[PDB]
Amino acid sequence: PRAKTGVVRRRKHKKILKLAKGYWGLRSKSFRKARETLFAAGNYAYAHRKRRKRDFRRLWIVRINAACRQHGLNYSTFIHGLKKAGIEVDRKNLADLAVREPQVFAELVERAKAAQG
Amino acid sequence: MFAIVKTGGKQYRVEPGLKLRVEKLDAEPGATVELPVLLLGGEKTVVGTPVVEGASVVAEVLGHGRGKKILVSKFKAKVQYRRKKGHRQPYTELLIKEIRG
Amino acid sequence: MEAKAIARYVRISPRKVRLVVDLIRGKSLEEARNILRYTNKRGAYFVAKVLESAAANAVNNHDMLEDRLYVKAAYVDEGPALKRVLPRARGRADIIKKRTSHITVILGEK
Amino acid sequence: KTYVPKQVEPRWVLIDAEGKTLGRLATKIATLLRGKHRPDWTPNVAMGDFVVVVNADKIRVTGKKLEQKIYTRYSGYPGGLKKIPLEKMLATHPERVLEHAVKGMLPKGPLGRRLFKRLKVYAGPDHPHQAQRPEKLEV
Amino acid sequence: GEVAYSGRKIWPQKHTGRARHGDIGAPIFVGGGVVFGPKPRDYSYTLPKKVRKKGLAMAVADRAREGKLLLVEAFAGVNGKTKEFLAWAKEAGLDGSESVLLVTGNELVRRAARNLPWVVTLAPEGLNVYDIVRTERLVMDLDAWEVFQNRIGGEA
Amino acid sequence: LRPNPGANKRRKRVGRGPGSGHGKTATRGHKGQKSRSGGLKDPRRFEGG
Amino acid sequence: HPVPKKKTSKARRDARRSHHALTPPTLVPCPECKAMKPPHTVCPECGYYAGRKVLEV
RNA sequence: AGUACCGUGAGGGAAAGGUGAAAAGAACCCCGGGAGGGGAGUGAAAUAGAGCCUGAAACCGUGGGCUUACAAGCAGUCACGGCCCCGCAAGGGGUUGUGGCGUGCCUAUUGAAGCAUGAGCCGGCGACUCACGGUCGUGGGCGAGCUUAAGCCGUUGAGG
RNA sequence: AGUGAGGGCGCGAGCGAUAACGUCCGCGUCCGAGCGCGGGAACAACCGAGACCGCCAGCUAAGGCCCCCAAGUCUGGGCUA
RNA sequence: CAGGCGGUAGGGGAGCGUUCCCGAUGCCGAUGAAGGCCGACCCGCGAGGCGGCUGGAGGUAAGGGAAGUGCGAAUGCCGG
């Protein structure tokens, strides 16, 4: 018989109240469109953690180009350098070092120019 | 000190800190266990030189424990196209407390 | 708290009443008085009086250096409304609800 | 890894312009006004160099001369999109012709914006650069 | 609940009050009639006497093998009054942590066999798998009758 | 107080509505509500006769 | 006939009600007694500058 | 509540349940024409105070934090930097300026951002069942297997 | 149990004016119904490519590397201007 | 080791709360039933505990059974 699903939904909904952080006035408490706006945000963070990869890709990309070239020769060149390069060829730091240990870059370099030849 | 060896994808460049990185849950089957990462990117406070030899020489090791875990965050799969379902971020590693060398 | 200036079911009105207090707060009985009194428009006495009780509650059972009582924190609230209905051609129901006003204004000491 | 941007690191520089050629010199001046070249190089600024160039005028033409018209269509609509040729272009506003190159590649409203801010020149002969009393880095 | 008081029509299902609906006091709204109605009913269930009794049996069997009080004999209560009946209990070893189904025509047996706890008052050759396994232990009198009845169950 | 239906017995398919997330149940309009449609068999009846 | 579309939030409502805003009433003291007097005026007390001709009864 | 109220009549046909445990439900003093407002007493509470239990969402309000006048964007949101916050640090909070990338959801569509549509905002209601026939499955009793209508015992009413 | 009508592209015949993001049939792919990523500016179906979930990891398609924006204003030999 | 894991119509599997029936009331409880208000431990989720505040009395499941049930959404229905 009975079935005052009330209890339930009042709940499901406040849940939603939180789901909704405190977005742009109206799509904030916006129950409905709130939820919606959310689905959005969802697929969004989606895209987000998804590609942040390429994000860095570039990040360093440039930071480093910045340094390698600043020194003597861009990517085809420098890169190819670490390339010919033997039991030593890393990346997720080329930047790092270029930065932190000026020497570090200056020489990773030196050898590298040679690395190519 | 700040040295570079890296693992599972370059998890490194550090000193003695609980710098938690990736799940190499193998010696993890024991709390603060120890283990080495083959260098590559040998460089410490003045003496800076080669990742080849990093690939082939000294290694470093840690004493580690703990894990981390599911780190909240969720992801809902929907398409304007007419649908939506979603879940929580499950990730971790027993984390490392750094052993010099 | 302090000198309470508030009251119920008097059908004046939101916004407007809010305007009044808007301008009268800040200062004390002296100044806000002069304005509430000689500045034109409705609310005039509603406001003023609310002031009055506020002040009485005040030097009466809060007391404090009477002279320096200045409206501190305050503004208004509107409760239900009278739901009245008028005529508007080809019959049809044209509805209205006049604001039965309540005021939430407090006199503070300083 | 991390690597956060320093703090108020100011550098300016004097560019010849004169004799140099249109576009290409632009490509340059251009990226020059980096935001990426000196450390912590990126979104929120970085270099870009408060760069200033003179003899802005006396630039060499991409061999085109006439057949290159800038526009100014503030136009109260059905007005004029004011077509103008490089000649007079410079004749009165050379610093600007270059300009159009410059903006040409400069991007981002608020940011690029700020950069043109740190992007100044004068087809004046140089004295202008003088007016810009400050340091005078150079190329 | 319409038929009779079905509110014929009230909305000019015409095309202007914007709204749809021709019938008032209509299903789909305000305290009116509701979907797949809560029809008065009953759960008959002619569950084959075969295994039905087969089981009543099986339950009797295990419940008993663990704790079986086929009395055939008993007596402690003025013919069977409460207090004295109780004494009996203490005798038959029946205490608190125990619930037993008292079953059989010893009407003085039922007569004193009330009391919410310990005992449940069943003086009839009225049995049932449930009450069976649900009542801690079976305790019953005219067991000549019973065991034989169960047998009748056994071979018709 | 324990003997839950052995194997499967208990409600096996009183599947409610149309799908956890979504829902709708069948085809297109041709089978709406007052839609207990072309029943048992159309051309099959042709056979019949 | 031309009923808008929605309401650019309380936001807008304000934008307006807002530039609107309620200013205050001009006053100095009685050229005669005390209290508030708006420029050229007298009142239920002093009431003058040259002949109260006003107040008290 | 078949009374309010619409219809000429025929006829249609609401809403509103609870103060508290008991009335002890408000002497009396104070602004006021009054309401109503501060006190005293009530009392276990009166944020239990007469439409007065529990008394949430919506919307409007008083104060505080961050934020904002060369800005073009559903949204957002990944990043980071400036604030302020709990913080032992780890760091966790809220807040965002700079930038990267981002056509809103439902229905019916070859086909949608929709300029096609539904969509005003909150809340409670709001829609694949029941009876048999069957029918296929498959969980369970014996192969010949099972029992209606009834007669009978029936707090439990016990099943036969 | 569901669609029982759909469109696009390529090739092969209709037709149509050898017109149309036309409509007819067929081989294939397609796109819906996954076809959510790259992409060509941005563009349901044109070349690349199948996303169960992570990574402040690296190799690649197509197609790109003066700049706006990752990537040689590479080298080599020409030919237009 | 495969090995695969966009995917509505549609078909199969597996869980979720939800108010009742036994609940073989176990009781739990004025050092709160309950609904509520807030929260960086549980869940692959539907949900969970648990902590803190309200709030005046309920509420209920170990295991299983019974269903007016879980809803933007229908120019919806009733009230703001």
CB-based contacts of D39, cutoff 8 Å, min separation 6: A99, D3, D5, D6, D46
- Which protein residue's Cα is closest to nucleotide H127 at C1'? E35
Q: Helix E49-66 crosses helix E143-155 at what angle (to 10 degrees)?
A: 140
In angstroms, the CA E48 to CA A86 distance is 85
Strands (E), B1-101: 33-38, 43-44, 47-48, 59-65, 68-79, 83-92, 95-99
With H, G, I as helix, E, B as strand and everything else as coil, classify residue C28.
Answer: strand
- In a 10 Å sphere around its CB, with 0-12 CB exposed, 13-18 middle and 19+ buried, how is residue E17 labelled? exposed
In angstroms, the CA G36 to CA G42 distance is 10
In angstroms, the CA E126 to CA E48 distance is 18
* Cα–Cα separations (whole angstroms), residue C98 to A100, C9, E45, E145: 71, 12, 65, 86
The C-alpha of F24 sits at a distance from chain B's nearest C-alpha, in angstroms, of: 13
Helices (H) and strands (E) in chain A, counts: 5, 0
Nearest to E106 by CA among E74, E64, E148: E74
With H, G, I as helix, E, B as strand and everything else as coil, classify residue B97.
Answer: strand
Give, in Å, how far the C1' of I70 lies from the CA of A61: 6
Cα atoms found within 13 Å of the Cα of residue G42, Cβ hemisphere only: 12
Residues for chain A: how many in total? Answer: 117
In angstroms, the CA A104 to CA A68 distance is 12
In angstroms, the CA D92 to CA D85 distance is 11
* Cα–Cα separations (whole angstroms), residue D130 to C71, D99, D125, F37: 61, 20, 10, 93
CB-based contacts of C70, cutoff 8 Å, min separation 6: C26, C27, C28, C29, C32, C107, C108, C109, C110
How was this entry determined?
A: cryo-EM
- A48: the nucleotide nearest its CA (via C1') is H78
In angstroms, the CA F14 to CA F25 distance is 14
B40 and A CB contact within 8 Å:
yes
With H, G, I as helix, E, B as strand and everything else as coil, classify residue A70.
Answer: helix
Contact D1 A70 (CB under 8 A): no
H-type helices in F1-49, by residue range?
Answer: 42-48
* Cα–Cα separations (whole angstroms), residue B46 to A104, B2, B5, G51: 10, 10, 17, 99
Contact D102, D119 (CB under 8 A): yes
CB pairs under 8 A between A and G: 3
* Cα–Cα separations (whole angstroms), residue E123 to C77, E120, E146: 73, 9, 12
Contact A96 D41 (CB under 8 A): no
Q: Which tokens is A47 given?
A: 């895209």
Report the C-alpha dihedral over residues A54, A60, A63, A68, rounded to 10 degrees.
-120
**Which of B41, B52, B76 is the closest to A86 by Cβ?**
B52
With H, G, I as helix, E, B as strand and everything else as coil, classify residue D71.
Answer: strand
**Chain F residue closest to B77 (CA)?**
F21
| CA max distance for chain E | 87
Place of tokens 């861009």: A74
CB-based contacts of D54, cutoff 8 Å, min separation 6: D14, D15, D16, D17, D18, D121, D122, D123, D124, D125, D126, D128, D129
User: Which positions in chain D have a beta carbon within 8 angstroms of at least one beta carbon in chain A?
Assistant: 1, 3, 36-39, 41-42
Tell me which of G14, G36, G43, G45 to substitute to probe the interface with C (most C C-beta atoms closer than 10 Å): G36
Q: What angle (nearest 5°) sits at the alpha carbon of residue B2, between those of residues B1 and B4? A: 115
In angstroms, the CA B63 to CA D1 distance is 23
- Which protein residue's Cα is closest to nucleotide H56 at C1'? A10
> What resolution in angstrom units was achieved for this structure?
5.0
In angstroms, the CA C19 to CA C34 distance is 16
* Cα–Cα separations (whole angstroms), residue A109 to A102, D3, F28: 10, 20, 69
The C-alpha of A109 sits at a distance from chain D's nearest C-alpha, in angstroms, of: 17
With H, G, I as helix, E, B as strand and everything else as coil, classify residue E121.
Answer: strand
Contact A63 D3 (CB under 8 A): yes
Q: Helix C14-24 crosses helix C44-61 at what angle (to 10 degrees)?
A: 50
Task: From chain D, pick out residues whose CB is under 8 angstroms from the CB of A95.
Answer: 1, 3
B85 and F CB contact within 8 Å:
yes
The C-alpha of B9 sits at a distance from chain F's nearest C-alpha, in angstroms, of: 38
Q: Is G53 left (phi over 0), alpha (psi -120 to 50) or beta?
A: left
* Cα–Cα separations (whole angstroms), residue D43 to A48, D9, D36, D111, E42: 18, 15, 9, 8, 75
Dihedrals phi, psi of D79, to nearest 5 degrees: -135, -120
A46 touches strand H (CB under 7 A): no
Tell me which of A37, A44, A93, A100 to substitute to probe the interface with B (most B C-beta atoms closer than 10 Å): A93
B76 and F CB contact within 8 Å:
no
